[PDB]
Amino acid sequence: YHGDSVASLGTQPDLGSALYQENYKQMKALVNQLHERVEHIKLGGGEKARALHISRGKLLPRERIDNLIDPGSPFLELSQFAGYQLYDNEEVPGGGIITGIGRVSGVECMIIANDATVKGGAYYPVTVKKQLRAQEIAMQNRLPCIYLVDSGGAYLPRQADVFPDRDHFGRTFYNQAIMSSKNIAQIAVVMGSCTAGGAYVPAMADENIIVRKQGTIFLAGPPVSAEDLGGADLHCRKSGVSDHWALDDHHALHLTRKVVRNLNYQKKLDVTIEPSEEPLFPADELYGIVGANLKRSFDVREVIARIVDGSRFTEFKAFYGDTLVTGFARIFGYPVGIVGNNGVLFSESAKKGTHFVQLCCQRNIPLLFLQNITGFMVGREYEAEGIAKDGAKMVAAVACAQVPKITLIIGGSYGAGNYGMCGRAYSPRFLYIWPNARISVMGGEQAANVLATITKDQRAREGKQFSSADEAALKEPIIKKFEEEGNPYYSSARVWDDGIIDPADTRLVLGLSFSAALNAPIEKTDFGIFRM
Amino acid sequence: YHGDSVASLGTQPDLGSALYQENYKQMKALVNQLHERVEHIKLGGGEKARALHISRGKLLPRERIDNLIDPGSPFLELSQFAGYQLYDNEEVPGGGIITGIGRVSGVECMIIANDATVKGGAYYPVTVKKQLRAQEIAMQNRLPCIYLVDSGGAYLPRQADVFPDRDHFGRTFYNQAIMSSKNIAQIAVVMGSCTAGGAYVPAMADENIIVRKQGTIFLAGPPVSAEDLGGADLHCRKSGVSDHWALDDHHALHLTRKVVRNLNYQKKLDVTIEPSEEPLFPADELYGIVGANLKRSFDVREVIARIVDGSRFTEFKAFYGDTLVTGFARIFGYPVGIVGNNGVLFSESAKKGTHFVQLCCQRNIPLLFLQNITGFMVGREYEAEGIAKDGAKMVAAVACAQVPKITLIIGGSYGAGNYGMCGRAYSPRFLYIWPNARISVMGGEQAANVLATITKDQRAREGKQFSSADEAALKEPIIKKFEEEGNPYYSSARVWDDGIIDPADTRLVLGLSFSAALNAPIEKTDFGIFRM
Amino acid sequence: YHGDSVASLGTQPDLGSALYQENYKQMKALVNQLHERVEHIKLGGGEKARALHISRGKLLPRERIDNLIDPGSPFLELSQFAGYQLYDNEEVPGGGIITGIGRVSGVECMIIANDATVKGGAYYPVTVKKQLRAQEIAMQNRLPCIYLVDSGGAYLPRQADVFPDRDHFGRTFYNQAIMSSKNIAQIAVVMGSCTAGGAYVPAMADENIIVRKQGTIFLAGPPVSAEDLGGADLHCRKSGVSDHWALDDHHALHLTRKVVRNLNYQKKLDVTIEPSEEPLFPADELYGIVGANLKRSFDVREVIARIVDGSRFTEFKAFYGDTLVTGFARIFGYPVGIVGNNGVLFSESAKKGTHFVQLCCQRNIPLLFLQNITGFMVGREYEAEGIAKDGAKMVAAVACAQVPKITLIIGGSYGAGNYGMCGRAYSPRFLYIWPNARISVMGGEQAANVLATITKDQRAREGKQFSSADEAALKEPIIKKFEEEGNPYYSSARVWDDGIIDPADTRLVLGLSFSAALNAPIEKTDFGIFRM
Amino acid sequence: EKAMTDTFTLQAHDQFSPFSSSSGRRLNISYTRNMTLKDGKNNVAIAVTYNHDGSYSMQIEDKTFQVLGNLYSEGDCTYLKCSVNGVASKAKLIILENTIYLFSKEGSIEIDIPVPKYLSSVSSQETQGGPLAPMTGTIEKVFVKAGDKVKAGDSLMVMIAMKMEHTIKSPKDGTVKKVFYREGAQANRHTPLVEFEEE
């Protein structure tokens, strides 16, 4: 009997209130800005580069991705803003590479395609980081990897940031070999001329598809003719590197779809499933509810009620540590444990979060974190020493969890609160931020005060005098730097926080992410010592 | 019957030859430079900082490490040159932290100690990277971790490079929790005032030792008195964070030694062992044999003969792919498979290396790589397309290997050869470089030629004219940048390549590294698809 | 380097103090009483029964055990006081059975021998419980079981308490079959006439030894001649039940020793070992230190210092929750984690105990509990509701532990404190009590007060009057009953708390128990939800 | 210390690890150990440097010494063969408790190893219960009643041991709480003779 009536979360907001109007206006402006920037990024490398690419008979990378995936299937692009203003004078739309998750022949796969229009497909450091992140996602979720290789190798300038280190270019081949050894299929489609770095990718792939004339695989470029040194006919017939021979881009994509079909893979789910139901409230009200000002506080229960199936939520320990919200819900019929922030973290909140995480790990339920850490303007210290003893517990419990974890940053994320609520350093399956989020070690004003106090004490101990003008001079740069570094676009330019998402699409993004992450089986969780 | 007489490798070099004298002179100069720089780094943060640190009654970090380890036991310091000229005007001797492997109570442990004299123990990005590398080494080798916590938290400037990302500060707590969950003991000794970041470390540690007065654990510093907010008595008696109470530094170290003894751990070896024998030739002849000029070539068999037990080597496939040297030997009684470079890599060399790696993985024998990749001055292309088909095989075989792997760079390391011979990206247990090594994507001259050709063709296609002066102007900066970035000190300043080692100490360093790495059991190796 | 000097626990008591003299006198009186009672129990069933048993040519059970075990090896008898005054008029010395652990052919084995002099070997309910306890000990520690079967079957009166239930006689055969299936050897020596219940024991045993004339196995007795129905010759030659034929008792014991030698078993230890050292103080001082009055309190550190190797103890969390003592020590070279009571349990004590238990389980170290729970005369309530939230944590942690656990009750054990400190219900490997211990749900005075208050309130609610004489009349029986039931002999008569041990022999008993318990490998520990 | 390290190594499965050596070796630098030894009432600071060749360079105050040697056993006595600044000598070495005994035909020298405070029981001394009997001997005289006011240097008891008279004297000016022995009693060595009232 699953019939039992259950109370539903959420309430109707007051549309006539001026606060709602102002918040809606600010959020709409932010979303419009994000949409226009994404459009410009989607434009590509440039007009002349696109014209040359089309003249060579090749397909644009987005067209390749559109033709590769199943008709009408949604595509979940990742890190669209990588490289946005990262370098002083060079423009790298999308980081020079395209990564995302889509369905090919009824199978969810991770797709990595080089954009030849951006610096001829050369690998910037951000490009390497983005590709490594995509490979790590695929390995964690056991998703087949498809590479649309068209690159000119590592960017010769800035080689030090791309070649040598562990997380540099060689990690790509390392991940390829490991995932191949773990029965995660690797498919490389040489859609254009590769280079020394590009050449190794098809070699390590289980299956290769090379275009007749555009495709050219040479371990070292001519700088002998390019076709003679490396070509589709040569690799297919004499060297044997190529596994399939394709006439053009469309034929290569068709062959890739066929190859994915004969993978002999069937997705099986461990968690229970229930029929999906839409939330009881419109998603666009989140604009008014949340707004763009971090000083004001909003109830996270509204956000939960607007993104869960049927707006049904079962709160756990409601009246203990009320600054933290935990409970059980279902998104698209998948069980989920929601952990959200409603204020400053205290000892009770940390203990409640630890208990909930233990329960979720025991029952093998995916976890979803909604982070809105608060500034210290309200409380200077509040005997934070008590928090340290209990904050760690949440940090360990979160780290040791083996269930699928997805983190969404809907507001500020500062200090150890970021680590506690499944920060980027704790390996969530996916991480997203809303356009109004702010992330940094501490608020700029707080940081400036800390630096000023340290200098005054040292100067006093030295006996030197700290001028009031000197203190003001020190504080102003720090405040500016922190404000600049905390921008969502600053964090998205670096491969941190995957990509920014419109709040109206949060439910769809979470559903797609959980559906992708459910491919891998859920392992048992082993916990360290609980410093009870 | 293990008696059977066996031929020994190596030959007596000609001391009277002028080439030997010149090589010896150059290597001696390099080693003297390295020794003097290491002495200056060992000096510490500064005179005033050291005086203040001693006046506060604390022990200097090197004195702490000396008193902690067993009497007379060797200490294997790691990444002594981290942060060497990394930042423009700030000096960070040793990266602000000290890491190494030593024996405590008869157990090999990884020790991480903060140097409070360097910017009050604040964490620079290089400091975080060094600590993460040490933690990764300990996790891979299953070594207990000991933290001598005395830090001021993250460096407030440059916060973006320390807080947010995955490999940033939070990864420290993540690794701590994971290693605790995997039964790898974590011990934290709060030898001085910590901070918000520092406070979490003792909380996550299994056992804590805090000094009576110097030790102060507060989740947030005063900027209430420091002792009242966080102190040894308070944490021991009321908050309960502290697990042991120490009167001073010596008492804390004694308590740490006792805590390690009661770990109930016994080291057991899987590989067979034989009595150790010294090599038949002096190690100091390596200076003359190798020299400092990378253009000249030397037989790697000499280096092998001067670092193996009894100079006994069993070459495998001697006459096939002679540019690569492979065979079996024993160092300090441990079996090892040596893979060295004697010239340019070819298809036969790649196949031979793949076969040897498969054999070593099957027999569960540790692997040792000696890299001396050659410049392309001798051969412009040599149909490198053939090499691509077979180079990958070695790259995959090396990546999928699960046996303990140690890489030593005795010369140049360029291009995909670095990846093939177990580069830093392929997770060797340890990586070391000699003072004369050079590492980069390609030789500077070769890179400049590649860039010039690309510009000329593009300009010609545009119809614009590429001036000969313009080509020269482009080439000169590239050559200078590559030469600067290829310095061993440049690579060691970043946490790549762990530390530089005197060639005379190669045998001792390798023995210590293998003894440390043998703590963990050797797992089975699973290989991906071999593109035979 | 294990040569670090370490401080030693314990202090020299004041022999001249009158308190020491009085405590010594009381403890000496108790020990003398225990020794004389044990002597009388060892006397056996009776003079006439012993004379008849000897006249039939058989050996007395204690002589059988003495001849069976290795020469000079110590024997650890269990539950010597079972059945002591358990039944109103029937005397059952030792419960009618003898159980213990001794070394046979260099192998530790559990020996169960029926005393034919006590009611012709009939099984009383206490006899069945004792045998089941011995079998459970053997199964837990993986010790081979040897049965010296000479019994007349179940006692026909009191059949309801011996036949029907789960823990009744059939559980003997169930345990025999299970332990045989788990490769724990079962050896039955039919040294005398068995019965229907006795007959099944040799049938289920892997190896049987039956004496030529005294041994008679019949599924149902004559009440045909006994020898014809069941006899050594018949069972050896025609029925085939017997596996070996023995001329007399000595021959049967020799054959049993040979059969054990032929077991092909080797004991291997998982824990590390160190050379054994004697404690620094005499054990007989425990008489004066502890005394016989439970009202006075003594420091458990003295008891620890008088029973550990070299009086070396490493206290853990000394100043937090000081009412509970925890630390690491070694007994006869084996590592052990000691958890002792020094006063009333509080929240801090419970948390400290939980942390220590987690550490011990993680490191795979045997645990030793010393229980001295305190009466509530000092504190009526002390807001015990706080204790409930944290007491449970210790109760769960103790229950889920998989390491060898041994509990010793040196004083009072009341209320939930008994459950927290590894009571009999939580399956310790062994449980012992000193002669001065007291165990019950609560102190008699406290219980009487609780009952009186309940009656007064109910009578008041009814409107009936509770007379002061009535309250006194209710209280006096309750106080007497609790005092009687709390006697150590009362608890030992029932198979609870194995046997009473002289405090001077505590070190030897603990060493023997741990040596026996180390036979089985130590499994991994899985914990439930920590409430945190 | 090196011998202790070898003893531990004997029982380890890894018997040839370089970590088991007592070289005290470091990468690109030399290890210098700060040792403290007590000669009489004087603390001596010794800076010992572990050389690559196995010798030791010791600096005491402004003087440097080159020291090399080894331990060898003759019968049951351990002998130290050492050379200081090129001067070679042999001596019998015994290390008991915290004292180093060196026996050479030139003479015998005792050196005390400082005892860390933590290891020393903290709050080791609370009160003194009268001078303890110098040895086991008969009590010949008692000069103090059960409650008597005494000043430091007031004779409390006279004891004869192996025909040698010792007079016990008052340690403090405190009044006497009690007496543990009477005249003619035999008192064992180091047994309390008088109890003094707590002040």
Ligand SMILES: CC(C)=CC(=O)SCCNC(=O)CCNC(=O)[C@H](O)C(C)(C)COP(=O)(O)OP(=O)(O)OC[C@@H]1O[C@H](n2cnc3c(N)ncnc32)[C@@H](O)[C@@H]1OP(=O)(O)O
């Ligand atoms: C893994 C390991 C271990 C080692 C290696 O991988 S070592 C790899 C060495 N690389 C090559 O050997 C490829 C050399 N390219 C070529 O052979 C071609 O160029 C192609 C193939 C790239 C197609 O491109 P194309 O030729 O069709 O067009 P083009 O406009 O010329 O393309 C843009 C123009 O390339 C310039 N450019 C700048 N940096 C690079 C760069 N790193 N690689 C290539 N080109 C670069 C760009 O600055 C200019 O345009 P701009 O910036 O002036 O507007």
Ligand SMILES: CC(C)=CC(=O)SCCNC(=O)CCNC(=O)[C@H](O)C(C)(C)COP(=O)(O)OP(=O)(O)OC[C@@H]1O[C@H](n2cnc3c(N)ncnc32)[C@@H](O)[C@@H]1OP(=O)(O)O
């Ligand atoms: C993990 C997460 C999630 C968050 C966090 O962790 S947020 C952590 C916030 N940090 C603190 O809250 C510690 C504030 N310090 C102090 O309270 C003290 O200072 C101590 C404790 C550091 C002891 O040091 P001290 O006081 O004994 O000596 P001092 O010489 O003063 O020490 C050097 C002087 O510190 C200056 N300095 C520069 N940068 C920093 C820095 N990042 N932290 C500390 N000090 C810094 C240095 O520039 C100057 O010397 P200089 O460069 O002028 O020569």
Ligand SMILES: CC(C)=CC(=O)SCCNC(=O)CCNC(=O)[C@H](O)C(C)(C)COP(=O)(O)OP(=O)(O)OC[C@@H]1O[C@H](n2cnc3c(N)ncnc32)[C@@H](O)[C@@H]1OP(=O)(O)O
């Ligand atoms: C498992 C299942 C599923 C079922 C079964 O097992 S159904 C088992 C049925 N039992 C028998 O079928 C054995 C019947 N005994 C005999 O055949 C013998 O007796 C021997 C073999 C016992 C040897 O003993 P014995 O004959 O050498 O000497 P005896 O002095 O006679 O021994 C003492 C005397 O036995 C009396 N006595 C009281 N209770 C019993 C009892 N339960 N069993 C035996 N004897 C009992 C005792 O009261 C008197 O002495 P007392 O108390 O008067 O002083």
Ligand SMILES: O=CCCCC[C@@H]1SC[C@@H]2NC(=O)N[C@@H]21
């Ligand atoms: O009593 C033991 C021998 C030494 C003391 C004896 C004394 S010496 C003075 C006197 N004259 C003797 O002959 N005997 C005692």
